[PDB]
Amino acid sequence: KRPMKDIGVQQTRFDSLVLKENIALSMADILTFNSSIFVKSYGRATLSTVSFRGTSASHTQVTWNGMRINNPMLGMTDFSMIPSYFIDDASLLHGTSSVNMAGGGLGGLVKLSTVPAHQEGFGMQYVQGIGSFSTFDEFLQLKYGDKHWQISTRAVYQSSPNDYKYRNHDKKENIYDDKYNIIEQYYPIERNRSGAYKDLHILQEVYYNTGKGDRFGLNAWYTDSNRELALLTTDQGDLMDFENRQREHTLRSVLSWDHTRENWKVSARGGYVHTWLAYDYKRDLGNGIMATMTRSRSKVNTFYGQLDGEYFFSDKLLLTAGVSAHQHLVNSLDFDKGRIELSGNVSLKWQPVNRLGMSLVLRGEMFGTKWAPVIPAFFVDYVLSKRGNIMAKASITRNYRFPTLNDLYFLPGGNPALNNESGFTYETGLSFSVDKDNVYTLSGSASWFDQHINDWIIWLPSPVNLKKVHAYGVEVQADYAVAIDKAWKLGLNGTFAWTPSINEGEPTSKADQSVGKQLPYIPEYSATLSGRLTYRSWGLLYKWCYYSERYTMTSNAVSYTGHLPPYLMSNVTLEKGFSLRWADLSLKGTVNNLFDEEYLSVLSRPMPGINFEFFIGITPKWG
Amino acid sequence: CMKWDYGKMEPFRATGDGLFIMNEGNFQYGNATLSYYDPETKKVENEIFYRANAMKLGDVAQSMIVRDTIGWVVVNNSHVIFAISTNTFKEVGRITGLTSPRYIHFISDEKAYITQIWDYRIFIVNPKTYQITGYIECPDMTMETGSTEQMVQYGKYVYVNCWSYQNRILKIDTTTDKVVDQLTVGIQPTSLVMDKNFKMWTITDGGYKGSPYGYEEPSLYRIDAETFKIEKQFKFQLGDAPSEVQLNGAGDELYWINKDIWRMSVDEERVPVRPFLKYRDTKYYGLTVSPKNGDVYVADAIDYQQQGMIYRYTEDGELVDEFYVGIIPGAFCWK
Ligand code: CNC
C-alpha cells in the first residue's frame, strides 16, 4: 500500500481542489482553514507567522522545489506572499518527519513544488475577481505541450486600497464647543488607513522528457510587491502625510535533472534566488517637501545545489543518500557577509515482514564554520489489523537548529559566539480507513507527540539562549465523503490539535510569573472543519476555523488592554459552472465573515466585517 | 460561535498624595497603560486610564507632567498627549497631530514646548486652544536622526539634550524662540536635570556596539548654568548603560541606575564606592525619589513582556513594599 519512502511518517497532503479553489487565497489562508497549524495574521495581504506544534516561526522550514525559502536574515517565511494558484503540490511534514528532508525543522517542514502538466496542444485560462473594498484580482494561465515539451506561464495581480469601515472600540472622539470642553464622546466609525497594496507574481516553467529515463526542468518565479503598513487601532488624529511601504523584488529559479533506471535513480538539482528589500517611512511637511524618517535597504543572493540518490536492493530493502549546499551571500546595506550551509543524509528502509517496517536516518550539517552533532531518526510502522487498516506508528529523533544570520551578525547586538538549539522528540499514533462499496469513505488518525526544546534563542536586554520549552499534545484529523443520492455528494474534513507549550526555564529574577505558563501567541486548542456539497453543476463550500485564547503576556495574567478572545470564523462559497460553445464559464461568489463579527485577532489591529467577492473564469475550448 | 469587545467606565475618586506610573508597554501592540499607587494605604490601581475612560491609552507612553490638578500624559507612538484630571482620571482634552513626541515642558500658562524623535523641529503648542503655534529648528539636525528629549529652564533660557544619534545639548531663548548656543558632550546624552546650586547634570550612553557613531565610554557631566564650560567629567568604563540621573525633592542628591543603583550628592567629588543598593540579580529599568519622605522606588521590568514590579526602599535602604504594574514601567510622576 504505502510506498517504502512513507514508512512511519506523519504528514498531511493538500490535494488539488483545496489549493485551486480560489485565486485570492495565499498559503496563509490555506494553512489557516485546512490544517491544525496556528497562523498569526491580522488580515489579508499582511505578515503571516506560522507556529507549528507549539514552536515559533523560526522552527518551521519551507522548501520550494527542494530549495529552502526562509529569509536567511530573519529565519521565517511570510506565507502571505505565496499565491495558492502558484503551488501545484503541498505537503506538511510533522515533527520528526522533517528530518527526512531538512535540518533544523524543530517544528516541521512545509514542502512546496510545481508539477508538470499533461496538456496536448495549446490552452489558456483567465480568471477575474471583483469584491468589496475596491479589491481586484486577476490570474492568467498559458500552457503548451507536445509529448516532449511542457511550457507554462502564470501571472497573478492583486490590488486594493483597504479602506474598510470598522467600529472602533479602543478610541473615543470628543465633541468640543466654543470654549474647548468635551460635551459628548462617541465611538467613531473609521476606515483602515495606510493599508493599500499591489502585488505582481509571474511564474514560468519549461519541462522536457526524453522518455528514456531523463527528465529536465526549469522554473522561474518573480515577485513584485508594494504594500503599506496599516495604522494601529489606538492611533490618534486625522494623520495624513504619513506613508509606510515595503517593496520587495525577488526571483526564484531551480534547475532539475532526473535520471531513472531499473532499481536505482539519481536526481541533480540547482537554483538561485535574488531578493531586494526596501522600507520607507516619510512625512509630508511644509507645502511640498516630503522628509524621510526611516530608510532601509537589503539585498540577498543565494546559490543552491543538491544531489540525491536512491537504490533498491530488493522490494523489501532500500537505500538513499543526498547532499545539499546553500550559500547565503548577504549584502545588506545600511553588514555584508554570509554563510555556507552543507547537509548530508543516509537512510535505510527495511521491510522484514509484511506487517513490520523500520527506517533509520542519519543526517549531518555544517553551517558556515561550525559542525553540528549527528541528527539520528528512527521510524517504525506496524499493522495492527488488515480489516480496518488499523496501523500503528512511532518515531524518535534529536534535532538541532542553527542560529539565524541576524542572531550572529547584526548591527546593534551581534553576538557571534552563540549556540544552536536542540530538540528531543518522540511520537506515536494510529490510523484507519474503512472504505466501503462506493457508499462512504472514512479515514483519520490520532497521534501523540512529546518534544523538549533546549537552548532556545531569544533576544532580551541580543541573543541570550536559555528558554527551555516543553511542547507536547495530541493531533487528530479525519476525512469523510458520502453520496446521499445519485446526484448529491457531501465531504467533511476536520482537524483538531491540543498543543500546550510550557516553558521549563529557571525563573529569571524573582517576580517571574512565567514558569509553567503557556507561551505568548500560541493557542492551546485549534480546530478546522471544511464541508463541500455538490449537486450537478452547483457547489457549496463551508470553511470554519477555531483558535483558543492567545495570551499576549508570558505570565498569562488577566488584563483589560491585552485580552484576545477565542477566534471563530466562517466562510461560505457558492459556485456555478456553465458550458458554452467556445469557452467554459465558472461563476462563484465568496462570503467571508459570514456572521459579521466585530473582533480583533491581533492586538490593536482592526479587521473587516462581512465582505464579498465574485469571480469569473473563462477556459476556451478548441479542436 | 461569535466574538465581541466593548468597554465600561468606572468612577475613580482617588485622593491623597499618590504616585503615577507610566507603563510603556510593548511596541506596535498598543498595550501602554497607566497606574496609580497610594503610599499611605499601600494600594495600587492598574489601568486607571482605560478603566475610567473605556478606551486604551495608546502605544509607548513616555512621560507625564502634573500641573495643578491636570496631568499631561505624552504617548510616543500615538502622536498624542492626553490631558487628564489627577483626581478622577477623566480626560480633559488631547493634543494630537504630532510626530512621535518625547517630552513636554510648560514655560508659561499659554505656551509649551514639545520635543520629538525622528524630527528636527521642536513643537510649540497652546495648552488651552490645543493647537500648534510654531516650530523651533535645531541647527545641524537632520530628519533621519533627529532627537531632543528633556527640557530644563534657567531664567529666560530652555536647555535640551539630543539623545538619539546625537552628542549635543542646545540652549533656547524663550523670548525670541531661537537656538542661541550649543554645547558638545559624549555620544547620546540621555537625560538632563538641574540641581539646587544651578548646575546641569547629564549622562551619556555608550552606544550598544555597532551604532554608526560607534561606542564610547559612558560618562557623566556637570555643565554649569550661566556659562556652559564643561566643568567636570566622570568616567564609567565600557559595558555599562547608565541613564536616568533625576534628583530628589530637595534637588541636592543624584540617583542613576548604572547596574548598581548609585547615590551621589551635589557639590561633591568623584563617584563613591558603596552603592545605595549593590546588586540582587535584578534588571532595574527606572527609579524615582519621593519629595515628601525620601523613599526610593525602583522599577523592575523582568523580561519586558509581563507585568513589572516596583520595590519601595527607605532612605536607609530597607524594603517596605513591592507591587505589580503594567508592562515595562518607564517613568514616575507625583500627584
Ligand atoms: C533596549 C532597547 C529598547 N528599545 Co530601542 C531603545 N532605547 N533599542 C533597545 C536597545 C537594544 C535592542 C536593539 N538592538 O534593538 C537599543 C538602544 C540598541 C535599541 C535601539 C533603538 N531603540 C531606539 C528607540 C528610541 C526606542 N527603542 C524602544 C523600542 C526601546 C524598547 C522599549 C519598548 N517600549 O519596547 C527597549 C527598551 C526594549 C525592547 C525589547 O527588547 N523588548 C522586548 C522584545 C519582546 O521586543 P521586540 O519587539 O522583540 O524587540 C525588538 C524591537 O523592539 C527592536 N527595536 C528597538 N527599537 C526599535 C526601533 C525601531 C524603529 C524598530 C523597527 C525596532 C526597534 O529591538 C528588538 C530587536 O529587534 C523605544 C520604544 C524606547 C523609547 N521610549 O524611546 C524607542 C522607540 C521610539 C520611537 N517612537 O521610535 C533607537 C532610535 C535608539 C538608539 N539610537 O539607539 C534605536 C533604533 C534602532 C535603529 N534601527 O536605529
Residue numbers in the entry:
A (entry chain A): 48 to 381, 406 to 532, 539 to 700
B (entry chain B): 21 to 355
Direct quotes from the study:
However, BtuB3G3 incubated with excess CNCbl in the mild detergent Lauryl Maltose Neopentyl Glycol (LMNG) eluted as a single peak and had a pink colour after SEC, suggesting the presence of bound CNCbl. Data analysis produced maps of sufficient quality to build two slightly different models, named state 1 and state 2. In state 2, while density for the tip of EL8 is absent, the visible part at the base (green) occupies an intermediate position between that in the BtuB2G2 apo structure (yellow) and state 1 in BtuB3G3-CNCbl (wheat). These observations suggest that, after ligand capture by BtuG3, EL8 in the closed complex is poised to move inwards and destabilises the vitamin in its BtuG3 binding pocket, perhaps acting like a spring-loaded hinge.
Here we show that the BtuB transporters from Bacteroides thetaiotaomicron form stable, pedal bin-like complexes with surface-exposed BtuG lipoprotein lids, which bind B12 with high affinities. Closing of the BtuG lid following B12 capture causes destabilisation of the bound B12 by a conserved BtuB extracellular loop, causing translocation of the vitamin to BtuB and subsequent transport. We propose that TonB-dependent, lipoprotein-assisted small molecule uptake is a general feature of Bacteroides spp. that is important for the success of this genus in colonising the human gut.
